Amino acid sequence: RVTLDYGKTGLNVDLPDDRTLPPLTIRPAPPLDDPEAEVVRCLAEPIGSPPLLDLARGKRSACILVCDITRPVPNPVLLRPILRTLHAAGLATQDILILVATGLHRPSTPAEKVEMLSEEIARTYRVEDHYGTRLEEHTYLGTTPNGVPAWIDSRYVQADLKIATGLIEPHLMAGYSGGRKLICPGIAAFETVKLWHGPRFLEHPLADCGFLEGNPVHEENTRIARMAGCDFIVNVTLDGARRITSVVAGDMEQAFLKGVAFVETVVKAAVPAPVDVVVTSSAGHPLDLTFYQAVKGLTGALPIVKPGGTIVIAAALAEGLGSPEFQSLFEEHPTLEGFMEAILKEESFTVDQWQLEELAKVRRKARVKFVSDGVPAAVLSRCHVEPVATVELAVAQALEQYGPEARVAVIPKGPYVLPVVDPTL
Ligand SMILES: *C(=S)c1cc(C(=O)S)c[n+]([C@@H]2O[C@H](COP(=O)(O)O)[C@@H](O)[C@H]2O)c1
Ligand code: NI
């Protein structure tokens, strides 16, 4: 018996005893007893930065970037100390903007702003959303040597003091989330993101979970973020129960890399050899709201599935498939092969196509069985996955085609684990 992450509830699955490896879980590092007190200490003694109070001296306006609903950042724990420090430094609440770094996601709703930020903060401060398809809300900062133009939200570019908050987790394109990613793509225009999420970047072998050095995705969003600037970040790591296990604050690159150095010591979980069947999740609520995000559980399982093996994923999909643009791609391209022909041979850019490109990467290696009660089976069957009524049935089906020596690996927390093959085991 194992509980997979699944919406707000989890999902209790019973897996075959003689076939299943010990579940892959991150290492049990100690939660911080008092994370808010730790944030306070880190703002007074940051990495590679003057203390926040001293940075904020004389500043007339501030813009604080926060993640949208898809990241479970405990924002009030980070924001209350920042906002106290800005108040102490003399900035009026009217001089402070909280900007939701949607990337190209839909804007957050009023209720989502309350769940992300707490009612007190959502009712007191101006909280606005980034709109990546509105180029008029962005400022041009230059073009990188790779030819990517940097278009960044003007409210951030024009603020005297620039602050970004976030969460360091594995990411299927950028290696790890956090740090610089709040700027690119968090508040970058489609004119920037369509090229940075284009196939010339995403087909690179190191554009994958856990890779930073040598990953052109990470090299390029670090460069773009530095053309905008960021005076101060606060980033956290979370364990499986969503408790904070580390806080880093300070310089956007040095604090990020310190956070990554810690998370690398807990997120890796190894198997002795790749397996025929991998059971995984999409990390539950809030990540698993849409099929668009649930592709992350599929790419996360790739390193430990055998070529031609099967990934079984459970995801609640409470909000359905994803954006209208994403959904239109399934109608426009009934096969992944035709989709890939379209985007590889010409400069063809549709909002959200990058997650269809990641799904194509998955299906070149593995079959997918998808368990969800959030989208009807008829819809999922046109999304290049096989809907199956239950995880236990999906595993039994997969074990039938692979035979008596086939083994099952299970990753209850899905893409928040970095599964690896270690032959020395
Ligand atoms: C990572 S490539 C990324 C992509 C998008 C797209 O729409 S593309 C959006 N975001 C959002 O940006 C914020 C920072 O991302 P991080 O990966 O959590 O560091 C966050 O609000 C993401 O939802 C990221
Ligand atoms: Ni992105």
Author numbering: 3 to 427
Text taken from the publication that reported this structure:
We then crystallized LarAIp as purified and solved the structure at 1.74 Å. Two protein molecules are present in one asymmetric unit, but the very small interface (386.2 Å2) does not support a physiological dimer. The well-resolved electron density map at the active site clearly indicated a NPN cofactor tethered to Lys183 through a thioamide bond. Ni is coordinated by two sulfur atoms and C4 of pyridinium ring of the NPN cofactor and the fourth ligand is the Nε of His199, completing a nearly ideal square-planar coordination. On top of the pyridinium ring, a density corresponding to a small molecule was resolved in the structure of LarAIp. The high quality of the electron density allowed us to assign it as D-lactate (a natural substrate of LarAIp) for the best fit of the density. D-lactate is bound at the active site through polar interactions with multiple highly conserved residues (top row). The carboxylic acid group is multi-coordinated with Arg73, Gln295, Lys298, and two catalytic histidine residues His107 and His173, which, together with C2 (or Cα) and the 2-OH group, forms a plane nearly parallel to the pyridinium ring of the NPN cofactor. The rotation of the acetyl group of D-lactate is restricted by the hydrogen bonds between the 2-OH group and residues His107 and Tyr294. Because of these structural constraints, D-lactate is locked in a single conformation with Hα (the hydrogen atom on Cα) pointing toward C4 and Ni of the NPN cofactor with distances of 2.8 Å and 2.9 Å, respectively, allowing a hydride transfer from Cα to the NPN cofactor.
